[PDB]
Amino acid sequence: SLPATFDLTPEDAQLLLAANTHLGARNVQVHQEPYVFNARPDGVHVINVGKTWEKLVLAARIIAAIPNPEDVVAISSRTFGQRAVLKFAAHTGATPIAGRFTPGSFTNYITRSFKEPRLVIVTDPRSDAQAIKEASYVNIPVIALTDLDSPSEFVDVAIPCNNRGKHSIGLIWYLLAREVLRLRGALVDRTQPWSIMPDLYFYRDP
Amino acid sequence: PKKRASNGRNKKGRGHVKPVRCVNCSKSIPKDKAIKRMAIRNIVEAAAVRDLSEASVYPEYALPKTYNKLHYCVSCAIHARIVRVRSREDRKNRAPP
Amino acid sequence: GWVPVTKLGRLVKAGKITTIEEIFLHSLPVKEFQIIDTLLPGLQDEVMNIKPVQKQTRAGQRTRFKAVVVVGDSNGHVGLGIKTAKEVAGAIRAGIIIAKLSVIPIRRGYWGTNLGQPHSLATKTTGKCGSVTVRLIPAPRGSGIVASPAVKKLLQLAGVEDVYTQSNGKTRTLENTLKAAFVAIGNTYGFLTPNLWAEQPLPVSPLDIYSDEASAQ
Amino acid sequence: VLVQDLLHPTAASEARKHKLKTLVQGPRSYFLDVKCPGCLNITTVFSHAQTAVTCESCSTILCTPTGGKAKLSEGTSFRRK
Amino acid sequence: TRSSVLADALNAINNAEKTGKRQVLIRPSSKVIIKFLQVMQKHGYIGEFEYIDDHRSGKIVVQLNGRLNKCGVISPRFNVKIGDIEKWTANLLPARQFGYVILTTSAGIMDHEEARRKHVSGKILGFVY
Amino acid sequence: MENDKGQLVELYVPRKCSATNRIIKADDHASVQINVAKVDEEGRAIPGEYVTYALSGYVRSRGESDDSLNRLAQNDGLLKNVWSYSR
Amino acid sequence: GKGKPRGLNSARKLRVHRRNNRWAENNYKKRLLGTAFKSSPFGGSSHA
Amino acid sequence: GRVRTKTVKRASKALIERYYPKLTLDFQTNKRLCDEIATIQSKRLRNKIAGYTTHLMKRIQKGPVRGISFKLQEEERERKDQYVPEVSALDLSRLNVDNQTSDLVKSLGLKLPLSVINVSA
RNA sequence: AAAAAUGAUUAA
RNA sequence: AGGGGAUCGAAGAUGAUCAGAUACCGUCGUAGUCUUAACCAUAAACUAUGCCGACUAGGGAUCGGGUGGUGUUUUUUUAAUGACCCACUCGGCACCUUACGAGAAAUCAAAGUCUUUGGGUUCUGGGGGGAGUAUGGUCGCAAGGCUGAAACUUAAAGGAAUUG
Ligand SMILES: [Mg+2]
Ligand SMILES: [Mg+2]
Ligand SMILES: [Mg+2]
Ligand SMILES: [Mg+2]
Ligand SMILES: [Mg+2]
Ligand SMILES: [Mg+2]
């Protein structure tokens, strides 16, 4: 069976609501359609936070299955995800890729930046399309932080959130790292919250 | 081979439009195909705006404008550098800028 | 010697992966030819044609030679490599490397009764490259290879000993003909048959089982 | 997509779809019991009448035809079914 | 206009199978279609299918199990002797060990193996493999 | 793959997609094998014990890989109320 | 589809269409017109 | 023209990477230091390298430069990258939700402090 | 928006 | 054939340019351009994509009709209406992304569902020329249209794309 402790806890529910992770895109693709809750006047849709949290738990279960922690590569070319992925890579092994992706990172075995990950997590499929495509060339499963209008091609595990907000992006990365640590012999306090407060995952200029 | 999906014009659904004449050469070109530009120009040049403002009975005069729709054939538009032949991939771009 | 760069090469060199069937089962991309050399040592080679291609420049025409190389043991593996280079020998050598990388498993079946080892294809298959369509059809025992000499040589290097072939398009384009036949012979494991209907337990990858000693720093 | 329950679809989805394009096609019009202030008679009218039906007592006009549903008169009450 | 509801049925099933769908809607779903589906269901190429009873012609929802490579009609329905069944199977089937050519014989709609067991022949309807 | 006297004769038996049951070819470089670690009490990943799904390059390129995974996880108990059979 | 009739009772149309389009071959046209007999320096002979 | 080629640019950048504290704003001592922190086959190239090194230094002094990370820069960057605010930018600080958001909370079955806001088209 | 024609055969 | 006949303008005139210019350019200008009553029946008459039917992909628009509103709007400062907004839906002219598919490619939501070849049906083609010629027929007042060869000749002609 599955323990009920993994349910949508009130605290991280308040966190997601404060981060506005439920305010999805105005336009929804049919592949993201099952994740929508309901549309508000002016057109803004609402993401089912229950689906978001459940998919985040599933993604964390994906991550905590590779025997090595350094071959779980995170990608974010967007400024709002640079700090988030760097902190995720600090807390877990998870060698990161912030900024330009340098096409040929997964192919081109003689490159110095060449990596052979077993799992790829990307902040935005649009901005990070090169990483997803090259993973499609080299048999790499992909978790992605997806909005309601983000493309679903080659995206294996989607997490329906708001990609237009730095608070939502940083919080989702924070929760993913926290859940991954919980599903390990390092963060046993499943009911207790993580020590450090999640503002270190948020980008601030410059 | 076929150069453009919209052959050289904008006509999909009727078959005949009407011909307009080029302003330069008076070449008969279908209206959907003619390169059309809006010439909205102040009736006085910038070198003269200050002078007419100084030499007007009517203080803060309206400073009227002139409006003209110009129809060019393809040849005259290219020769006058109105359109400036583009590359193959940039040929599809419809944006005015 | 050979110092592996990828995890697959590290596993194969260390000896954790012993047969190319594991490679094919997990559909692992292969990037080093030494993997193919050490997993299929009895992989023999053949050059199909050498043709010159020319590029026009200010100072005349510069000529390079494009070599077509077919590798394969007669026990169900072939690879096709096309490489252009300044010299014929260099093009042939790089073509051998490329074909070894592009080695593929084929499915031998029976035409009628299954008396003995498989002798033909399990199903008629068709491949296309450019205008050339190649169709391979299962044939009864004692039929031989009914094909043009190039496709016949590729099929012998594949291990097929009984098959009919039907071609269409400009078959004199040898590289298109060989690529089309390579696609057709590779689609044999792509075609699903009732004897493959049974569900399998979906085994885990050697890149995950023998993973603690891979990608060592 | 790629896996759907075509036999048991959503009532909101069928309410969205075209009248001819549901799992089993059927009408979306209806019949109205109509009461005018003139008398106590009840007149059964069709939602998309396409005629100017008239009451037995108020024998001038009850509804006006339109493109779709009939435009019932302002001095009139109605009840579905 | 429609001339073979069986052809539209098998084309729709084939397109859903190619696109990876696990279920397909068929209309108008005659009883020849139903017999064709029962033959392929007997051999395992499809799963459960459902007749929707609208009061005009019916519908079928077929559950697809991904085991079907191609199904289609042979139009027109040529008459076939006993000895031309082998020629038709050679022409239409990928292999001699699996796949079926569907016949409409006086004994009923059956597959070519069943026809050869019954020593019967008829018109050719379609194929499945 | 079976000859007269038993003795299965074949190079290898290919895997089938967990979503569409199509064969994953040896050169299908867009395919994946998603691996979900089983979880015991109080949330431990217990490495080495897994539930495995094979997804084809075709379905991934089509964009239904995520919905296929939602359905498979729902059917296998990994997820609770994510995938709805009736859309 | 295919721009040619398919019905079981269209054999006359198919045969006539093949007969008509057969006239676009060279050898069939020569055989049917008897050009070698009529317009050829030899009377269809190998030598003369 | 006086564009400095990649050999001068890369050698100067490497010098900045390796000996930023030792190097000084002026060409004379930068040139003298180059005699032993590097081996250059020609005095002309050494002078060019030192001139570009001191130019890069005079630019680094008034703000950082892209692509160059001297020893005193990455510790500063990482220390800046640990700024933890005392109060969370998002926390219990007054939350504001819509009718649909309240409906979502009720559907998921949770109890939170919500405030009603009606979005107007 | 001045005028501006021509260039033997073979010879990769 | 009658009327009309401003404009522009096959022919023509005439001035330039030019080696020549009975061309381009300039100025005139008959027939035509317009109309009525009759003829003619041809166009790169083009989407160079026959027609009918089914299915397969992700969007934003727009035209016509219809449906619905914890919608607005000039009237009653809270009425049908009309006009906008949002969500749909049927039909249409079309666009954007990508092809999973097709194609020699250019490209194509059809040019897909094609050697895994069969939904129905009409028309046309069979290397380049000779040649849409000759002849016969038929229509036209004529111009010409429709139908339409052969002798003979010849190794390419041709499509798309690449480099220069
Ligand atoms: Mg051209
Ligand atoms: Mg026209
Ligand atoms: Mg046209
Ligand atoms: Mg035409
Ligand atoms: Mg329209
Ligand atoms: Mg000809």
Coordinates of C-alpha atoms (C1' of nucleotides) in Angstrom, one line a residue, chain J residues 9-10 34 39 47 72 81:
Chain J
rG9 C1' -4.9 53.2 -77.6
rA10 C1' -3.0 46.8 -82.3
rC34 C1' -19.0 51.4 -74.2
rC39 C1' -21.8 35.4 -83.8
rU47 C1' -4.9 25.8 -56.6
rU72 C1' -20.9 44.9 -20.3
rU81 C1' -33.4 44.7 -29.5

